[PDB]
Amino acid sequence: FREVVETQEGKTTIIEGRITATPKESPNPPNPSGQCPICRWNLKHKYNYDDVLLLSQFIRPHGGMLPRKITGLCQEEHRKIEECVKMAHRAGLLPNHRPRLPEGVVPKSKPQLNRYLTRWAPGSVKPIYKKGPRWNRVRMPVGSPLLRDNVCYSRTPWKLYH
Amino acid sequence: VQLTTYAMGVNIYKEGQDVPLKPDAEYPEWLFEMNLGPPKTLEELDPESREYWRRLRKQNIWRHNRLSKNKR
Amino acid sequence: VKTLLPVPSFEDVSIPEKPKLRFIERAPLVPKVRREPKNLSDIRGPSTEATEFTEGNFAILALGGGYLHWGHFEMMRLTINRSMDPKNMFAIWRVPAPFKPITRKSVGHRMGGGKGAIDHYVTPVKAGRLVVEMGGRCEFEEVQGFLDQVAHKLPFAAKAVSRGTLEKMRKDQEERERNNQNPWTFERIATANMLGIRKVLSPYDLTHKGKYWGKFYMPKRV
Amino acid sequence: GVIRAIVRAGLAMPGPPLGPVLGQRGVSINQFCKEFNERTKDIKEGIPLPTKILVKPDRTFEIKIGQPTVSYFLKAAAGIEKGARQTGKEVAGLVTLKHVYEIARIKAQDEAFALQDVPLSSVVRSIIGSARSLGIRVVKDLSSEELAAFQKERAIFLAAQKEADLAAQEEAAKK
Amino acid sequence: SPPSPPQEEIGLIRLLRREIAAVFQDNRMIAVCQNVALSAEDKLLMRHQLRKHKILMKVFPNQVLKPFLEDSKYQNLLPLFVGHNMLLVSEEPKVKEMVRILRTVPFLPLLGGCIDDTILSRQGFINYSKLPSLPLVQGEL
Amino acid sequence: AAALARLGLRPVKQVRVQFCPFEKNVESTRTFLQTVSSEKVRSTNLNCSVIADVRHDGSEPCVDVLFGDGHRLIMRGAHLTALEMLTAFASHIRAR
Amino acid sequence: EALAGAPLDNAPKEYPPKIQQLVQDIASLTLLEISDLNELLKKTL
Amino acid sequence: FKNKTVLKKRCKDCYLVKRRGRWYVYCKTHPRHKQRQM
RNA sequence: CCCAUAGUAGGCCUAAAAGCAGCCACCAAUUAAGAAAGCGUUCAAGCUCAACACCCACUACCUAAAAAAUCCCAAACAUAUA
Ligand SMILES: [Mg+2]
Ligand SMILES: [Zn+2]
């Protein structure tokens, strides 16, 4: 990889860009004819928001996302991975990819409202005060619609609004 | 009043003698090949020549100007 | 370098005299004395007239049935005549002047006592009929913009189309029809009276093929 | 900064349009006009001619004199005063290619053509284009053609210009 | 995806190749330099200051400059052409006044070039410029 | 390159860029010379000069900048990219 | 074909070898052939 | 802020942002252009 | 994401109308920039866009949602095989 290190010594700031170690691909990917890493490793429709081992290979050291021109993902898999990583961030997963901040974590907010498959940003969704009639109820989005094509073993489709 | 009026008395031979025009045999020959009346067209022009691409680009600019009247 | 392509030339298109839209009168010169019934079938189903381009290359295509009246005519004519270029574009009507008489009874009237007096006139329009056509030495984008402007204000669904656009829509409809993957078709079931479905369907559904519902047209219905 | 304008050689009065722009620039205008006029006193005609003016922080100005206008030179070689109203459909006069060669050889030493590596061919092409825009007409050889062409054209153009002037007359009457 | 249908070469790049080959064959030496993002008026000011001694300048796209460098004998010129680059086509090789008129602007780098098929760096160019007069060099032996 | 034009490059008094054109890792500092020799970034103040030191045996891109307060900011950019060192230099000049 | 790698002379360590070959051919003899050099090189000069 | 069902930038300095589950058009040059989705 | 030199303040008309008040023409230099597409200007000027040079992630599945009066309204739940 690459990094920038700044050394202040005697009113002189040395700015250096150094190259560090980098992990390569595994020796024998199963489908070398594929285009995306997901297609190459046959992971298409085979990963969820729980697969942090797969998600964290596409994300910045501070919980951010990496661009497609670097990762190599297709447009569809990029959106799938980005939404999955948002849900993983909101689910309390990825503890070491927290946003960087000098001292702002000391005023701890509301305690651990445990949650998962969180689609929207928790601080921007209004309560459902009226719920509508039986034939049109205001449902609650659970999960992401961009994972509707994942492999299903339950013989019943995944429920996205419940 | 003020408006530029310097109108030399152009007679049948005024501008043939007011300035020292040299005989036709003394000017170089490359002067008498210019396209005078109409400008030349794409089909007349060779896709290899640079003026071909200049004219094609002028047509492209005209098309862009025509189209870009309602697009913000 | 960016590769360049020749501009589409216009040396075989001649604009006619009087290029702006003709004034449309609200009522016929000879008013109709006899009052006719509301034969609602003149806006039902597909249009059989004015479905193809005649002289222009752009148009407003109706995607649903409805009645055009003088307010609509004035709106479209004024917007077109104030938004087009007389020297390079010409616009031609494709719907007649309002001729169908709509009668209404006096306000606060009980039911009965004959029909009402003729109040105004309308032009029936079916889905798939071109309403205004446009031609000249211009591309499609400017006319598409200021014609979708007009089409959004029509009493029915409408779009701004061109020759190539309309041909593309028709070819895509045929392609969808042939590559449809389920084996159960409205046409097949309706024509074979499968499940006795004609007790729910209409005699017009044998020809509408499920694509038309009242004065509404579904272009994704196959 | 720079100032782009055209002013007559022997006539530059401390007023509009150079007045307000130079006043907003912040430099004396009488000194500039007197200096310019005394520079161009060496011209025996009083030829309008463009001027590039450059200013520096210490409130003094350096001015570069160029060549006169191709519009002026072409209308002078044509012998007409005003440009044609209907360019392309109406002819403003007749000139020969020797005149445009002379104009090019006398103009190419200005700041807009001697600053580049332009042959006289591209310069005369530019002059021919500006002539077409002006509406004047250029053909190949005019030894015996020009004399008869001038003979007929002076009369027909005087008649047509009188027609245009009376056109302006009834237009000004019908208000 | 199946192999792309390759395009055919256009007249622009074809004649660009022709003229670049012509000026690489007929000329004596070439001086490449960096295309400073400098104003147009001053840019033509230098352009005229260089042409006043009868030496020309040109600018060409890299996407057509590179293949000539790769497939010709001038391969070693390629790795210098990674940015905003221009070339000075100059017959009757004269370097003294070029260096003198480039020294006024210290941000114009002469990244190098060839001198009768002899490619030298910037300091190479300066020490080649410092070479004695050609009649003296000829008469030395 | 409008970032420096808006940030007012006027604190600086001298900048110099050293590189070898015949080396593969000089593009960043070369295009930094390009963006720092721009008309606006240089016309924001006419009391500072830009220097293009050209050598062949150095084999290393480097940048050395000195401004009014006497501080010497050196960034030997051969792995460090143009935009990164650009925003670093801009941040340094706006801090001081 | 190809061209020489062409290094710099601010740190001079290498020089073209065609010069070495020609000098090894010409510069190991007495005045007998130096007279040939002097008489002959000036036929065109 | 003005409520709109369709939002469009009225100048080059208008920018669309997605905040509090809504689409806003924010302009710093002309605060006149501030629009909020409804 | 850059980049805006020129015949030229193209002529006519206009007090002035310079690409941008209205029309006719729309050539033409440099490797590149339209007798000018948006503004903007009293006229100018200062801004873009169209143009070389510079690399080039996509440069976009089109749009297609709203509030009334006593008190929301089953509880819930995305992943063990038709
Ligand atoms: Mg401007
Ligand atoms: Zn705005």
Swiss-Prot record, chain A:
Keyword annotations from UniProtKB, A to Z: Mitochondrion, Ribonucleoprotein, Ribosomal protein, Transit peptide
Subunit structure: Component of the mitochondrial large ribosomal subunit (mt-LSU). Mature mammalian 55S mitochondrial ribosomes consist of a small (28S) and a large (39S) subunit. The 28S small subunit contains a 12S ribosomal RNA (12S mt-rRNA) and 30 different proteins. The 39S large subunit contains a 16S rRNA (16S mt-rRNA), a copy of mitochondrial valine transfer RNA (mt-tRNA(Val)), which plays an integral structural role, and 52 different proteins. mL66 forms a zinc-binding site with uL10m.
UniProt feature coiled coil, ranges: none
Organism the protein comes from: Homo sapiens (Human)
Keyword Ribonucleoprotein: yes
Domain of life the protein comes from: Eukaryota
Protein name: Large ribosomal subunit protein mL66
Subcellular location(s) of the protein: Mitochondrion
Recorded family membership: Belongs to the bacterial ribosomal protein bS18 family. Mitochondrion-specific ribosomal protein mL66 subfamily.
GO molecular function: small ribosomal subunit rRNA binding; structural constituent of ribosome
Additional facts recorded: There are 3 mitochondrial isoforms of bS18 in mammalia, localizing to 3 distinct sites in the mitoribosome. bS18m (bs18c) binds to the same site as bacterial bS18, mS40 (bS18b) binds to a novel location of the 28S small subunit, and mL66 (bS18a, this protein) binds to the 39S large subunit.
One GO CC term, this protein: mitochondrial inner membrane
Full protein stretch here: 35 to 196 of 196
Biological process per Gene Ontology, one example term: translation
Major location (coarse): mitochondrion
UniProtKB/Swiss-Prot annotation, chain B:
GO MF: RNA binding; structural constituent of ribosome
A GO term from the CC aspect: mitochondrial large ribosomal subunit
Mitochondrion recorded as keyword: yes
Any one GO biological process: mitochondrial translation
Keyword match Lipid metabolism: no
Top-rank taxon, per record: Eukaryota
Subcellular location, record wording: Mitochondrion
Keywords: Mitochondrion, Ribonucleoprotein, Ribosomal protein, Transit peptide
Coiled-coil ranges from the UniProt annotation: none
Chief location: mitochondrion
Family, per entry: Belongs to the mitochondrion-specific ribosomal protein mL54 family.
Quaternary data: Component of the mitochondrial large ribosomal subunit (mt-LSU). Mature mammalian 55S mitochondrial ribosomes consist of a small (28S) and a large (39S) subunit. The 28S small subunit contains a 12S ribosomal RNA (12S mt-rRNA) and 30 different proteins. The 39S large subunit contains a 16S rRNA (16S mt-rRNA), a copy of mitochondrial valine transfer RNA (mt-tRNA(Val)), which plays an integral structural role, and 52 different proteins.
Protein name, entry field: Large ribosomal subunit protein mL54
Lineage: Eukaryota, Metazoa, Chordata, Craniata, Vertebrata
Gene this protein is translated from: MRPL54
From Swiss-Prot, chain D:
Single Gene Ontology BP annotation: translation
Subcellular locations according to the entry: Mitochondrion
Domain of life: Eukaryota
SMART domains on file: RL11 (SM00649)
Stored Pfam families: Ribosomal_L11, Ribosomal_L11_N
Cell inner membrane is among the record's keywords: no
Gene Ontology molecular function, alphabetical: large ribosomal subunit rRNA binding; RNA binding; structural constituent of ribosome
One GO term describing the cellular component: mitochondrial ribosome
Main location: mitochondrion
Keywords: Mitochondrion, Ribonucleoprotein, Ribosomal protein, Transit peptide
InterPro entries: Ribosomal_uL11, Ribosomal_uL11_bac-typ, Ribosomal_uL11_C, Ribosomal_uL11_C_sf, Ribosomal_uL11_N, Ribosomal_uL11_N_sf
Record note on quaternary structure: Component of the mitochondrial large ribosomal subunit (mt-LSU). Mature mammalian 55S mitochondrial ribosomes consist of a small (28S) and a large (39S) subunit. The 28S small subunit contains a 12S ribosomal RNA (12S mt-rRNA) and 30 different proteins. The 39S large subunit contains a 16S rRNA (16S mt-rRNA), a copy of mitochondrial valine transfer RNA (mt-tRNA(Val)), which plays an integral structural role, and 52 different proteins.
NCBIfam families found in the cross-reference section: L11_bact (TIGR01632)
UniProt family annotation: Belongs to the universal ribosomal protein uL11 family.
Protein name according to UniProt: Large ribosomal subunit protein uL11m
Organism name: Homo sapiens (Human)
Gene coding for it: MRPL11
UniProtKB/Swiss-Prot annotation, chain F:
Subcellular localization(s) per the UniProt record: Mitochondrion
GO cellular component: mitochondrial inner membrane; mitochondrial large ribosomal subunit; mitochondrion
Assembly and binders: Component of the mitochondrial large ribosomal subunit (mt-LSU). Mature mammalian 55S mitochondrial ribosomes consist of a small (28S) and a large (39S) subunit. The 28S small subunit contains a 12S ribosomal RNA (12S mt-rRNA) and 30 different proteins. The 39S large subunit contains a 16S rRNA (16S mt-rRNA), a copy of mitochondrial valine transfer RNA (mt-tRNA(Val)), which plays an integral structural role, and 52 different proteins. mL53 is located at the L7/L12 stalk.
Superkingdom of source: Eukaryota
Keyword Ligase: no
Taxonomic lineage: Eukaryota, Metazoa, Chordata, Craniata, Vertebrata
This protein's name: Large ribosomal subunit protein mL53
Family membership noted in the UniProt record: Belongs to the mitochondrion-specific ribosomal protein mL53 family.
Keyword Transport: no
Source organism: Homo sapiens (Human)
Keyword annotations: Mitochondrion, Ribonucleoprotein, Ribosomal protein, Transit peptide
Main location: mitochondrion
GO biological process, one term: mitochondrial translation
Pfam annotation, one family: MRP_L53
InterPro entries per the UniProt record, alphabetical: mtLSU_mL53, Ribosomal_mL53
